[PDB]
Design a protein around this ligand. Structure first.
Ligand SMILES: N#Cc1c(NC(=O)c2cc(S(=O)(=O)N3CCOCC3)c(Cl)cc2Cl)sc2c1CCN(Cc1ccc(-c3nn[nH]n3)cc1)C2
Length: 454
């Protein structure tokens, strides 16, 4: 991260006199104080708590400077109207400074996303960096940019949306050289009206691109009204310019042929969508001087990530939302908010299962308690709590919810009511229910999610 204090202040329109402080070359930028090391930039954001509360901890951990919306006594600080806007301005600047080629991709559906496939193909030739996990939003994307290893030649940025316009912002921020749009399987759509509005939002990905730049978009007509006018658009799907003409899905792998490729590709995954993802990633990689042979060998060893978190089904028909990514309090708040904003299926309830977050140190109990502000008796019919640090939150919810709408199960260094928790979830979960599970990744949460799926 080639950045100094005065340079950031310049870039973000610092409102304080920065010359008071040394112009130190910075190390990395973090919004999670646990990740701060010597020489870092702290970025205090509105999370489950406002990151301003953790500025002192950041400096104890070695931060050299912090962005801030208020004066910070006894520490170097960069005073701005809004930290996140500053963060985003900084990432956009960093892209201008490094002039890295940016590849923007939407839509993350399973265990081998277009973002991961594309980065993997570009890596054959180029120092390539990419969005890690699900860091694809107004916070994750700027973080990704600022974490790009010095010398990177190609940067693959996934861009997600929760509300229409989210992708416009990210595209205008990143100014992609090239973009890919894929459509997924909504199930239920949270803050989006219908499939058209979904497609509208995804096609904003081309908003920040220069005329004549390449955009891959599906053949599906839902995107038609939203096609850019001044980009080079290439469609993919049955009948379109890019097309899969043959496909064998085996045991645990798949072989397929794309019209524009000389030979079949082999992938060590299953599913239609993956062949499509492979195909469109391949096309772009070809445009970047990667050979078909390089692409074929590359796919012989492709990474599977965690299943990019979404909905599953229990074997009784219920809708499971298991959120494995990001075991931190803000991610807990946020998934609570998202899950809560989904309407319940006709005939069904909404159940949340919450377990202890880990590595919150001395602050663990209070940060769990903080989730009370994200729990609403109106939308959540049953909240079930599992762990030890989460006990006080369970108590708070039991006071704030109707009689009988909360359950707590103990998990300590000795006692463990996992067995009871499982029974209770099974008894409470109807065929038309929605159930959210969120905690750290434990063997038990994993055993639970599995007793439902089975
Ligand atoms: N709120 C909050 C906290 C965090 N929030 C995040 O990591 C975070 C996580 C997310 S996110 O949802 O995970 N996100 C990632 C980016 O892509 C989008 C999805 C987002 Cl959008 C935003 C934030 Cl700000 S991480 C974290 C917190 C609270 C405190 N933490 C550890 C800690 C422990 C002890 C002390 C302490 N205080 N006094 N003595 N010790 C201070 C901090 C770690």
């Amino acid at each position: 991260m080639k950045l100094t204090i005065h340079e950031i202040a310049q870039v973000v329109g610092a409102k304080n006199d920065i010359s008071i402080f040394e112009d130190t070359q910075l190390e990395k930028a973090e919004f999670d104080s646990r990740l701060i090391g010597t020489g870092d930039l702290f970025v205090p954001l509105k999370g489950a708590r406002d990151g301003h509360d953790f500025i002192e901890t950041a400096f104890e951990n070695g931060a050299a400077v912090t962005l801030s919306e208020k004066e910070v006594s006894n520490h170097p600080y960069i005073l701005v109207d809004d930290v996140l806007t500053a963060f985003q301005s900084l990432a956009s600047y960093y892209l201008e400074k490094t002039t890295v080629d940016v590849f923007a991709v939407t839509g993350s559906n399973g265990k081998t996303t277009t973002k991961d496939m594309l980065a993997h193909l570009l890596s054959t030739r180029y120092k390539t960096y990419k969005t890690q996990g699900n860091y694809n939003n107004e916070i994750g994307l700027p973080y990704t940019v600022l974490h790009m290893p010095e010398g990177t030649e190609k940067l693959v940025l996934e861009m997600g949306q929760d509300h229409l316009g989210d992708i416009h912002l990210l595209s205008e921020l990143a100014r992609p050289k090239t973009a890919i749009v894929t459509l997924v399987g909504e199930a239920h759509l949270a803050f989006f009206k219908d499939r058209s509005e979904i497609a509208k939002g995804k096609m904003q990905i081309a908003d920040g691109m220069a005329s004549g730049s390449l955009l891959l978009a599906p053949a599906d007509p839902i995107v038609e009204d939203y096609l850019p006018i001044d980009k080079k658009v290439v469609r993919f799907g049955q009948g379109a310019e890019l097309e899969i003409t043959d496909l064998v899905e085996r045991k645990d792998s798949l072989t397929f042929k794309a019209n524009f490729l000389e030979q079949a590709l082999d992938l060590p995954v299953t599913g239609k969508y993956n062949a499509t993802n492979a195909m469109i990633a391949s096309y772009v990689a070809l445009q970047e001087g990667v050979s078909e042979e390089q692409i074929r060998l590359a796919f012989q060893h492709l990474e599977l990530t965690r299943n990019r978190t979404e909905w599953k089904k229990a074997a009784n028909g219920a809708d499971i939302l298991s959120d494995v990514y990001n075991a931190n309090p803000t991610a807990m708040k946020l998934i609570l908010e998202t899950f809560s904003a989904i309407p319940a299926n006709e005939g069904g309830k909404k159940i949340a299962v919450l377990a202890d977050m880990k590595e919150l140190g001395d602050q663990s109990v209070q940060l769990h308690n903080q989730m009370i502000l994200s729990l609403s008796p109106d939308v959540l019919d049953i909240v079930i709590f599992y762990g030890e640090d989460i006990a006080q939150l369970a108590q708070l919810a039991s006071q704030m919810f109707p009689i009988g709408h909360v359950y707590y199960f103990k998990k300590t260094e000795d006692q463990d009511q996992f067995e009871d928790l499982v029974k209770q979830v099974k008894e409470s979960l109807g065929a038309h229910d929605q159930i959210l599970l969120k905690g750290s990744n434990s063997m038990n949460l994993a055993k639970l999610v599995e007793s439902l799926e089975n």
